[PDB]
From Swiss-Prot, chain B:
Name of protein: 11-beta-hydroxysteroid dehydrogenase 1
PANTHER family attached to this UniProt entry: 11-BETA-HYDROXYSTEROID DEHYDROGENASE 1, HYDROXYSTEROID (11-BETA) DEHYDROGENASE 1-LIKE B-RELATED
One Gene Ontology molecular-function label: 11-beta-hydroxysteroid dehydrogenase (NADP+) activity
Taxonomic lineage: Eukaryota, Metazoa, Chordata, Craniata, Vertebrata
The organism of origin for this protein: Homo sapiens (Human)
Its biological purpose: Controls the reversible conversion of biologically active glucocorticoids such as cortisone to cortisol, and 11-dehydrocorticosterone to corticosterone in the presence of NADP(H). Participates in the corticosteroid receptor-mediated anti-inflammatory response, as well as metabolic and homeostatic processes. Plays a role in the secretion of aqueous humor in the eye, maintaining a normotensive, intraocular environment. Bidirectional in vitro, predominantly functions as a reductase in vivo, thereby increasing the concentration of active glucocorticoids.
Subunit comment: Homodimer.
Positions of disulphide bridges: none
Length: 255, 258
């Protein structure tokens, strides 16, 4: 990895107002990328754009809205496009707000989780592809342990996250033979410093929490190296245990 | 602790997507074991032709309810107006899927959405709808999935996302139910290539593997939900069974189980 890599670079970061998303903003701004950030929360985004500008961003812009809204999602990429001079890398990071609870019958939240953490990711990917094909760019899709392994209390979430792996890991095999030179990186994250995670695991989880500023960069690094996947967790056993190598082989044979 | 056709006799079993392929056979076997059976699917007389064949084999009770699992309400209600037909629900077999051909993904969000709605959401909806009854029956949910549901495949991106989703949701729920001492089993079935008409033709001149027999497949699925297993693996390759099990996942789930 060379940060010279992101020198003149055009990067969208969704879910960019707080947490791991913001920090990418800032890393991307330090590396003097161009950045367009998004979330629902307008007044927060003003604050990160201007922080990005301070930090050395080649340029920085926000566009606020909600990714339950597919036409906003599709419209978001075209404008993001036009603000910078095209697009080099698209980092899908946002998620519908969630917390730990047993699942009872909340079917609105299963649906919302599916639409916002999954479907919006497809809608943004479809819209963003022309520009990415022109730069041989990159999709970075942020997932989690619970999108690789099953965990109780995060059923909906987990379902949207498995979906992310399924859909994109499949798109990527398609791209490969389609001479579609857009890379696709799946980030698998354990617990991270962020305010909203720390508050959500409120004594429910006794798992060491990883620095958010560092995870942020790991995500960029990975996507910039066109890596199929990024694992990022504090525990040692997890990083070892989380990899599925028989998936890799099994895929070759079936290939 | 062996499998006995005897096991499924009192049992009120819903089968979905039963008007053809695996689903049909599943309802044949069930009836041969003398269970009450309700089946759904969109198309109506194909279902009549199944309810009817289902007595010739020796059910206990056979009905059907036509509707598209595209509509959450139908799903809510179908279950309701079906436990009402059998007295309770004892087993829920979920296996309907929205027609998917096999093409590279371009811009068909429509197909993606329909795929999530029909292939995943409806199963959740029906689970919710079926639960009061199952919690009581000590029932057995059984979700039919696929290799594409555990492993990546080109051509089936939207389909794959919906199968991968069934695993991440139903495995969590399994975990919650386990801690809630909710005594409902959840069986995830990973199926390889099966010689259904849909598959046969969907995959003609493209996926070059053996085609596990449909009628054998469906029994394996039942034996599975019958025995309260966490998963069943039915494919026609030795490689497959041998590689597809993921012991790291089970350990990772253990470690974290504390
Ligand atoms: N933190 C952790 O421990 C882990 C995080 N991850 C992944 O990290 C990514 C970021 O997580 P984290 O930073 O902790 O989460 P945060 O809750 O801190 O960040 C959430 C971001 O997404 C935004 N958001 C929420 N709803 C919507 C919406 N409907 N439309 C658009 N934006 C929305 C929020 O902005 P706003 O409210 O203003 O709209 C905010 O910018 C997620 O994909 C998560 O799945 C994975 C594993 C662990
Ligand atoms: N066949 C194979 O090789 C494999 C099968 N599987 C899984 O096996 C299960 C059954 O597959 P298979 O039997 O081959 O496929 P079929 O096409 O034979 O089965 C489709 C069933 O779904 C019903 N259906 C279709 N659309 C809807 C709808 N919108 N609402 C309600 N019902 C609908 C159909 O009835 P109608 O169209 O009349 O509505 C039919 O009874 C699926 O879950 C599939 O994922 C997994 C891997 C491989
Ligand atoms: C039990 C989940 C364990 C955990 C380390 S936490 C996670 N994602 C979080 C979901 C919880 C909602 C609060 C913020 C969202 C990010 N993924 C994981 O694998
Ligand atoms: C490339 C698909 C490899 C295959 C064995 S076939 C599959 N599911 C089928 C999807 C095909 C659409 C029509 C029939 C429905 C069921 N799952 C797999 O793993």
């Amino acid at each position: 990895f060379r940060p010279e890599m992101l020198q003149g670079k055009k990067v969208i970061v969704t879910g960019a107002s707080k947490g791991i998303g913001r920090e990418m903003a800032y890393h991307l701004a330090k590396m003097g990328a161009h950045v367009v950030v998004t979330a629902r929360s307008k007044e927060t985004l003003q604050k990160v754009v201007s922080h990005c500008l301070e930090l050395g961003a080649a340029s920085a812009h926000y566009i606020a809205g909600t990714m339950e809204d597919m036409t906003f999602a599709e419209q978001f990429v075209a404008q993001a496009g036009k603000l910078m001079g095209g697009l080099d890398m698209l980092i899908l990071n946002h998620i519908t707000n969630t917390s730990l609870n047993l699942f009872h019958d909340d079917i609105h939240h299963v649906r919302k989780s599916m639409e916002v953490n999954f479907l919006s990711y497809v809608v943004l990917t479809v819209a963003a592809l022309p520009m990415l094909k022109q730069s041989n760019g990159s999709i970075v899709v942020v997932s989690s342990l619970a999108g690789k392994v099953a965990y109780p209390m995060v059923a909906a979430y987990s379902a949207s996250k498995f979906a992310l792996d399924g859909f994109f890991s499949s798109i990527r095999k398609e791209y490969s033979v389609s001479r579609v030179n857009v890379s696709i990186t799946l980030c698998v994250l354990g617990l991270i410093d962020t305010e909203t995670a720390m508050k959500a695991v409120s004594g429910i989880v006794h798992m060491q929490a990883a620095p958010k500023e560092e995870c942020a960069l790991e995500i960029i690094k990975g996507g910039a190296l066109r890596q199929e996947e990024v694992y990022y967790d504090s525990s040692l056993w997890t990083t070892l245990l989380i990899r599925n190598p028989s998936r890799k082989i099994l895929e070759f044979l079936y290939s």
